[PDB]
Design a protein around this nucleic acid. Sequence first.
RNA 1: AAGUCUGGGCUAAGUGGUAAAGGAUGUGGCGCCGCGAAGACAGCCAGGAGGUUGGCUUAGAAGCAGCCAUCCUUUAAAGAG
Lengths: 66, 185, 130, 66, 141, 37
Amino acid sequence: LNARRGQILGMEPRGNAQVIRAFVPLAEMFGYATDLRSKTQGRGSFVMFFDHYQEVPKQVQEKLIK
Amino acid sequence: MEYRLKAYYREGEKPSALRRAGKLPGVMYNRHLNRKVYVDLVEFDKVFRQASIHHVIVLELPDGQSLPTLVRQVNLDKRRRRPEHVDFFVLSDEPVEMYVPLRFVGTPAGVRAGGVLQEIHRDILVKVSPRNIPEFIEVDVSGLEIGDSLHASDLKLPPGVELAVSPEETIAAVVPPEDVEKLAE
Amino acid sequence: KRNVELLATLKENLERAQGSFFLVNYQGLPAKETHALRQALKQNGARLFVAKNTLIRLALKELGLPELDGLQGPSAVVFYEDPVAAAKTLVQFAKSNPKGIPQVKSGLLQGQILTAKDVEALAELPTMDE
Amino acid sequence: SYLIRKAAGLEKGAHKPGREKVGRITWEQVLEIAKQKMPDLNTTDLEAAARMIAGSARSMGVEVVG
Amino acid sequence: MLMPRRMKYRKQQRGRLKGATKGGDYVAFGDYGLVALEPAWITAQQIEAARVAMVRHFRRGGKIFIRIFPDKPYTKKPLEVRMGKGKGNVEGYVAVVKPGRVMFEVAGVTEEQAMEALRIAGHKLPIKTKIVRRDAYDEAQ
Amino acid sequence: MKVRASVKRICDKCKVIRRHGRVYVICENPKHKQRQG
RNA sequence: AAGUCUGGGCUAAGUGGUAAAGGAUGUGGCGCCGCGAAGACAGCCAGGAGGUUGGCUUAGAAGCAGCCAUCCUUUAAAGAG
Ligand SMILES: [Mg+2]
Ligand SMILES: [Mg+2]
Ligand SMILES: [Mg+2]
Ligand SMILES: [Mg+2]
Ligand SMILES: [Mg+2]
Ligand SMILES: [Mg+2]
Ligand SMILES: [Mg+2]
Ligand SMILES: [Mg+2]
Ligand SMILES: [Mg+2]
Ligand SMILES: [Mg+2]
Ligand SMILES: [Mg+2]
Ligand SMILES: [Mg+2]
Ligand SMILES: [Mg+2]
Ligand SMILES: [Mg+2]
Ligand SMILES: [Zn+2]
């Protein structure tokens, strides 16, 4: 998730099972549907709810325009 | 390339005895003679280790004589990997059968590809006058891809120096190279 | 014994291709400054010969067996000795005597000094181009 | 050597150079290059200068024609 | 793993590890060998462990020569059964090996690499072993 | 402490020591510590 | 019962006075290479600099995520680390 530009909010147990909560730019979240299942061997899930927009870093915002 | 090595006569002494005392029993011979000799083990080792069965060793006898020999066989102690006894063939001016090294030249195509140069022969049997031993014999191996060989039939030959074994006798080969991507089967 | 013998030679060859080679404390400075007195003396002199650094022990046997008196100034210390006659031996010894007397305190002092063929002297050497 | 992209054509590396070529440059197009951004460099020559990109081209995926 | 393709006899008497090695006491193919310092029946599974270890360390490269071969059938009575009522069943094959035998040899690889491989394969073996290199003494036999 | 029959240098900074009769390995790295046993 | 006998050596574990793979700067003795007053090994005083961010990759990997390349340069010496 850090590979996807993510600020990590924390972790917690659930069904044991550990949860992970973090802000990932939806931009870097296409493949994560089956990219999760690839790394948990068919034992993963996620939810994803928009929290906020924010200015993309100038390395991109001054480059996506091309 | 002209190695010499001090060698002393022996008669009744027990081999066990000579061996306890640093010495290495052995015998020198040829069609004309036969003497039981011994040599200091570490002196002989320093020598033979580079002389092998390849280059003339020259025996400095105590009576003063100075015989050029080839080492003809070296008996090993099977349990300890020590040399137990040496045979010294006393070279005459006739031609004599012998082993001469094969230096394998260059770097084959089968290496640089994965493979390995199996050197089926690291020297060769040869009729030759003592007055011209080639401390070498080059073989171009560079043309080999993995799968290929090279026999005595190839292999140049200095004059001269004839073979002394069927040229149907393979001397190198490039075989494939172990590899873990095999394995699981 | 050793390949410090291919160090005597190529440092006695390009030593016995002159007559007035001087000496200085040539390690003291950064790799910026140690390309500064190096760009300049590769211009303010001749060829690419500022300090052709090699061992104090080697130069002293070298400037001993190739005769040249023996620059008994002091080969001691981080000393690489600026081949002054492997450059156009001139009043360009100021290119040195100025370089370090400004850039970092004592940043290129001298020591031994052989002028023409006879030894100059200590401070008779930095006053020998100023 | 940023300049080297407009003398052979390419804009990218070769990922596996050595056997793969995707362009070429000769003994003289290296000398012109050994001149432009050269008040900088390090040395001052032309043959102590050309062998400075003649292998900075093979570090990506372009060879030297001789 | 290793075992005879066919035999004349299914089972054979145990015999006896007296003696130095009869044969195979010099290196004869590669540049480095592993030689046995103690007598044993070495099993196929052992030899095979020994091999695999070497290849996994070479990891593409080199030739491993395997100079012993397990052709002596090993018998075992079924667990929890009494004495008698016939010789037991063949459960595997072993190589009789006596001191001074070169068991494996390697070639086409560095000294700092055969050394290790051979160091390792020793570990899989149930005896003490020295690592050797070719010598003239070898060449001379 | 790792207590083992086989103690060895693990990394280039590892150090083998014998103390009060007993072979140890000490190291910059706390995981590398070993007493033989 | 009869030597706290004589001479040379080793052991520091009460080893002697019950055990294996294997591990080990234990200790004593051999042997063989390598460096060494053209000044080594250890410590410490400098230097460790360029082309250059090595291309791609990718949001960015600038000597160090990873596919690969790995030449030369002023040099006493400074790996595209
Ligand atoms: Mg020996
Ligand atoms: Mg029986
Ligand atoms: Mg039998
Ligand atoms: Mg068994
Ligand atoms: Mg049975
Ligand atoms: Mg074992
Ligand atoms: Mg041997
Ligand atoms: Mg035979
Ligand atoms: Mg372990
Ligand atoms: Mg420490
Ligand atoms: Mg007493
Ligand atoms: Mg006790
Ligand atoms: Mg006890
Ligand atoms: Mg010991
Ligand atoms: Zn460590």
